[PDB]
Symmetry: D2
């Protein structure tokens, strides 16, 4: 079983399609049941979807309780962008950023470790290149993405000797959440389709080595 | 004028006593009016204190709104610890942790940039060596300290060319991250206070203080 | 053409085997002429090899001057280990460690940028997880691996707006086998549509 | 006793003057005996100086052989060299590696060998170049990153020993050697149960 968050659009939905196309069972979550339906009606081996607000620890606990089996992979791709000079940023929108990126990540990973730490699960945490450097006009975005990286690098240490593993993925140059201060009318981006193809290829480990951390970037 | 947050106790209280001794005017904030008064009884040049919840951006706006002049240094030392293996951590307490560390840091820094980016204010952001490395049983605490590091490294890029500077401070080995051999708030404060220097065309932009 | 350094044995040899097996032409370099002969005897699409001291800028300049074509990929896997508490390390071996790891990476990447920065070459720089963290009893190995990461991260900034790309690879201790790391590295590196895998870390 | 490398001029020379004014005994080394003489003529508490090539482990071994046990060792020896990597001269790159990385390794190794069980504060002065990549500074970044990998590794090896490594990262030396000296000398402290372990100094 492959559980995918943020699966109603973007990288999460494109990953769903590649796993489904390999014949594998997927369970999809996102905020919009309407959008989830449309993704899931392209699939042929999908075993469910459920709209959830991952910023709610109660909703995340129910998400995993209702599954029929232990997932073999969980891909966390939920998140959102918000940008601008710090003094121009709206605090309510900053709070939403924290909820959608950091809270969602903490609630999902905590629930995974609670339930499945002694199970061979591959937890794929999708972050952003913003997790690894600072960026002008992205201060709170970097803040929440750096927060997720500190979380996963710590939890990796708590998972020493356990079969659960965390895989860190850092995309850059996708629509999902990019910020240009000027440009021509928006090949401006790495498509979700192509990012998902590369991420999926790298995670398909056929030997005794595995890819623990991967960065994928647009060329330009 | 030196504005100190987190000044009810710990590092921020001990810093206030050092600035005060040099004959510098302080304005203190913390969550307990009562603890703030006890700190202020130690001081002879204080120009006021006020309880504030820094997680509220409106309270932070009003904190700086009621000041009679432009601070020369602002010391942000507000924060709290919470610890344990992640499965053992209580979600409500994790939410409090995010509030006390990340929300408070964001609100204070945002308000400082808004009002004072074009003034020579030294903004001293006190974090933790948890901001610099991952630590087992401190995953959400690392998360919020890493978050604050990313915030400030990004705002430093926005402040290019401007007179406002952010100074990053990373203490480790203090009692407040224990989950006699620890470094004391008074010792850490003497070191941070001594080290903070702007001499000639330079300044100490980043400092790490540890126990040995 | 795929040019592979450090291909006398270990990871570089194993990668050469994988590329060869997809039908791609390779050209190998390493310290041992005889080990290179042995590796290439296994290969069916190899177009040569040349023993070289990569610590010598002259020998590296010759390596690339003798080549007939602009390579499409260059895989830099030359390196060596040496371990121990710093006080127990021999300075003569520390100097060999700097030559094999840092000097080699500098000379190869310098020659590549000099000749090919304006060509769509994928330069795959293999370092170590020792490039990303400090390690007790590996202080000088961390030193040379960190050096290489500082180098490549700086050159990436110089290559802004140019077609040459640097791909960073961080394998754990090899512990993995050289064969297992090669499989995963070869399997993960990709350039699809508008994007590419820029950095990978591989562990057991 | 404060032993200072890179003391023939610049930052090490300015630090010597500060410690000397406090009445502290200094022993100075650098590349030029003549410049060391000029610096030491300003001092009233100096107990010697000696020209040394720190890239030579034998000369470093003898530097410490002929010396009491130092209380602080300040390592400020180093040098700069810049330019796009393809424009850099490989002989100047080799000099960069010798002056920065070999010097740091030899000094720190000798110190750990001799004094790891003594309360010595070892102040390793690097550069903000150690902390980030920089275009036109690829090899300088390489050597400074290398030293940071070295020290962060040796710090793990020193866990539970009285010797402490202090990391200093100067940036922008419009910042003068004199004012960088003041803030560094000003910030280092071992008050109570704690110490300043890492300092970054930048220009206003």
């Amino acid at each position: 079983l492959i559980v995918i968050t943020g699966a109603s659009s973007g990288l999460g939905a494109e990953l769903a399609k590649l796993y489904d196309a390999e014949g594998k069972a997927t369970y999809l979550t996102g905020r919009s049941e309407s959008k989830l339906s449309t993704v899931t009606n392209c699939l042929s081996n999908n075993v469910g979807y459920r709209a959830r607000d991952l910023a709610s620890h109660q909703e995340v606990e129910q998400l995993f309780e209702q599954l029929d089996s232990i997932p073999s992979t969980v891909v966390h791709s939920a998140g959102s962008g918000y940008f601008g000079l710090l003094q121009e940023q709206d605090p309510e929108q900053i709070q939403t950023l924290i909820e959608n990126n950091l809270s969602s990540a903490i609630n999902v990973l905590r629930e995974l470790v609670k339930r499945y730490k002694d199970q061979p699960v591959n937890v794929v945490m999708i972050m952003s290149t913003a997790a690894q450097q600072p960026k002008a006009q992205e201060s709170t975005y970097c803040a929440v993405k750096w927060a997720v990286k500190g979380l996963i690098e710590s939890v990796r240490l708590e998972l020493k000797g356990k079969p659960m593993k965390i895989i860190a993925v850092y995309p850059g140059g996708m629509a999902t959440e990019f910020w240009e201060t000027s440009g021509k009318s928006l090949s401006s981006f790495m498509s979700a389709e192509d990012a998902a193809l590369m991420i999926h290829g790298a995670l398909a480990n056929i030997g005794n080595g595995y890819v623990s951390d991967i960065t994928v970037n647009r060329e330009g």
